[PDB]
Structures are given as C-alpha cells and as structure tokens.
Structure 1
Amino acid sequence: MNLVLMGLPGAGKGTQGERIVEDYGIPHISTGDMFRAAMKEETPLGLEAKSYIDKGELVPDEVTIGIVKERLGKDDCERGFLLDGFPRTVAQAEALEEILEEYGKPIDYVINIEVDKDVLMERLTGRRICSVCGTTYHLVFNPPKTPGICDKDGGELYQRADDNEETVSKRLEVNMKQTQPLLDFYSEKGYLANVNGQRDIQDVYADVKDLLEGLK
C-alpha cells in the first residue's frame, strides 16, 4: 500500500492521513513535519529549510528529495507508506519515480484532496495544533472539547508560525502553480485519484477508504 497525499495548503492531508495510518499501519511521511522537527532540534537541515518554510516558499528540491529517499528506505516502509506533502513539484515526482524504482515500490495511488482555494485561508488561520501529538483542530469546524488543549493528551494547542494571512497567501500562491502539472503528471501515470475534500472529515475519509480497500 504505497500512497501519496497531495492538496493545497490546509486541504486536510494531515487530518486524512491520521485515519489512513490508523486503519492500515503504514508510516505517515510528511516532509513538512520532518522539516519542522529538524527546525526544533536545530539540525543543519532544519536551519536551511527554515528560511524557506518561514516565508511560505518551497524548500529546494535536491535536499528535500534527499531526505525523502532516505526515509522511504527504512524497514517500516516494507508494507507500504503514506507520503504527505511530497512530491509538490514535477521534479520531485520524477525523482520519486527513480527512488521507488530502485526500492521496487511503485505508487498505488496519488490521492488529491481537492478543496477550493477560497476556503483555505479560513482553514489555516483557524487551525490549532497539539504541541504534544501534532493532531490538528479548527476553532470552528473541528474544535477541541476544552479550548486550548488536546482531547487526547491534554497538551497545549498552538498556532503554526506560517499559519497567518500573509504566509498562507504565499503558500497558496507557491503551491497553486505546481498543482495542475502534478495532476497532469499522475493523470498520465494512471493512478491519480481525486477526492472531494469539502465535506465532513469522516465522509472525506470514506472516499479514501474505498480506494485503500483494494490494497491489501
């Protein structure tokens, strides 16, 4: 079960990915999360990626592909994986092809979580994240039972540094110009799957589960 999750900033990759990993146990591989984990620890990778991430721009291809290649090689990817936020440039997709060809692990589906760009600003500025677990909530659409704290572990919720109007706008701008080419790339490959991301969380996942049940 080799999957790729794509979508514009705030479309819900993390939210949906959380379900997939729960029902199938494949590693959730989010480049955004990997970069931020590096930033917190202050690794050389983190400091280099930080400059781009803080501005809402894409981190350069070479270093991004590099850390992904290493990750997909781990033992825990034996039964499949869930790539989140990678690739997000045609170059990255082409590179992933080579990488997976060497690993003998072809992509089963590239799942595009389609959400109108017009409602993504609201989704991001209203997002709050668990400082302990990473799971996300939304002040309006998916609020925590007790404001400011995670339902699961009681950890404090925070607002990502790049989740403000200006940076969100840049993020939408940057990724929108990469969107159609990626869709065309995988549409040609023959395994692009479009999912309506503008509905209730569990209803979005139902559409995702339909595809996954054919991958055991």
Structure 2
Amino acid sequence: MNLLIMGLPGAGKGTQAAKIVEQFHVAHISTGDMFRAAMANQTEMGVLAKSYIDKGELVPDEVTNGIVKERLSQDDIKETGFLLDGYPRTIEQAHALDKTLAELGIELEGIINIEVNPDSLLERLSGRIIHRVTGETFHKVFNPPVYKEEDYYQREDDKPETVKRRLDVNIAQGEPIIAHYRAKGLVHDIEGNQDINDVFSDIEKVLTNLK
C-alpha cells in the first residue's frame, strides 16, 4: 500500500502508524523521525533542522523534499509500499511529492486524515513520554507505560510554548494540502477523538477497503 497519514500535531499519527506497520507491513517514512535521527547523530542536516524544530517551525522544503525523495526513490518501496507520516506539510511539498511519485510510477492509494479536536492537542503533547529504543510514545494519563525513567524521555519540542507555535503553524498549512488530495478522491477522514484501539479499528476498515 502507498499511503499518507496526516493530522495536526498530537493527533496520533505516530501511534496509528505503529499499528498500521504491524499489520500491513508498509514502510514507515516519518520526516519527524528522520530529522530527530539526523540531530542525534549530529549530521549537517541535523544541525540546520534543529534550529527550526526547536522553535516549532517548519524545516525548509528543499531539504525536506530531498530526504523524502531519497527515501521514495530507493528500490524497496516499489514492492513493499509506504506510509508517509508528517509529509507533505506544505502545498509546495505536496506538488513536489506528486511529481516525484509520477516519475517513479507510484500512485497514492489513500490518505488517512486523522481529525482531532484542536482543544485536545496541548494536553496530548504535554503528557507525552517516549520510549528510547523504539520511539514508541505513551501518555502519562491516556496511555501510560507498564515505568523506569532510564528507558524514557520527553521531546524538546513538546514544551507548551513550542507546542503552541507548532499548532498555529500547522493549522494554516494543512487546509490546502488536505483539499488538494480530497479533490483527487484520496482522502479518508478518521475520527481521532476516540480510544487508540477504536481509532485504529476505523483506519483498518478503510485500509481493507482499498484497491
């Protein structure tokens, strides 16, 4: 399957991606993960990305498109399918993606659009804790771990003032992107305001209705 998953920050893209990958075995491509990996390994791209990510701002499109395209162009994806998560995040990236996909002879089969009440998102991100090895996320109230602190951390961009900036930035950029793909008949709206397993149940029905 060739899929996009999108939603505002904290809407549960990563949480749902993990469950999607477990069942459908698509390749998870998360720009967020790629940036954070670059940072932790102190690559050049990591140093530049940090200055944006620490502020809750979008990383420039050219760097973002390039790394996505690099991933999309590799030999795996043709036969395994992917789940693009956190990209495209600007309409420019959407156009870049579409061109890139056409060149490669790859077609999007669906967009999973997780809709969540924006009033829920500050709390989702403020309570997030992250398992180090897997990057699996938990929530101290809504989805607590079975704890041991050495195994967890909190994302730098999850401090409330950064979250508030992230939300503003992405509420403005997300509307033209969803419309772009809805116009192509590719958008599936998911009720994100449920338990994690109920959200997944909805997504699973969508994915087993494709193709």
In structure 2, the residue matched to 1:117 is 118
| Offset, 1:148 | 3.9
Aligned twin of 2:2:
2
What residue is the counterpart of 2:53 in the other structure?
53
Residue 207 of structure 1 corresponds to 202
CA distance in 2, matches of 1:210, 1:73: 29
Partner residue of 2:109? Answer: 108
From 155, 159, 163, the equivalent of 2:154 is: 159
The answer for the alignment partner of 1:189 in structure 2 is 184
Offset at residue 180 of structure 1 (A) = 1.2
Normalized against structure 2, the TM-score is what? 0.97
Deviations 1:113-142 (A, max 9, x none): 101111100000100001111000000000
Would you say the 8 A contact 1:26–1:76 is kept in 2? no
RMSD: 1.1
Deviates more, 1:71-80 or 1:181-190: 71-80
Q: Is the 8 A contact 2:129 2:140 kept in 1?
A: yes
Deviation of 1:210 (Å): 1.0
1:152 alignment counterpart? none
Q: Percent of pairs identical after alignment?
A: 58
- Displacement over 3 Å in runs of 4+: none
Q: 1:7·1:114 contact (CA, 8 Å) conserved in 2?
A: yes
The range that moved more, 10-19 or 72-81, is 72-81
Q: Which runs of 5+ in 1 are unaligned?
A: 150-154
Question: Which aligned pairs between 1:124-143 and structure 2 lie closer than 5 A?
Answer: 124-143=125-144
User: How far did residue 157 of structure 1 move?
Assistant: 1.0
Number of aligned pairs? Answer: 210
Structure 1 SS opposite 2:103: helix
In the other structure, the counterpart of 2:85 is 84
**1:171-182 matches, cutoff 5 A:** 171-182=166-177
Displacement, 1:10? 0.4
